């Protein structure tokens with residue numbers, strides 16, 4: 001899938017419990033975690049391969065593409081959950097971080 005590098009989105013990472021609210025620039029062909037790391041923002045992660053839930057976030061605003069290989073169900077995707085290690089922005093976004101436990105609780 002061709003994703004264009006010079007297309008750049010404003011990705012606001014938010015965590016109310018922790019008082020996090022930081023907006024970074026993320027290229028269309030870059031995973032959100034990898035951008036946050038390049039720009040000095042630590043986010044939770046474990047496998048970094050799309051194959052766990054440790055890096056889970058949840059979309060508040062906008063859109064993302066979750067990589068096909070990611071181990072998220074369509075139901076979970078439809079609920080707004082994202083694995084940031086393996087997701088590309090497709091719009092200016094607001095995403096709440098540290099959403100592992102809420103993903104695990106999704107019925």
Ligand code: FES
Pocket residue numbers: 044045046047048049050051052053054055056083084085086
């Ligand atoms: S860190 Fe395992 S899915 Fe992202």
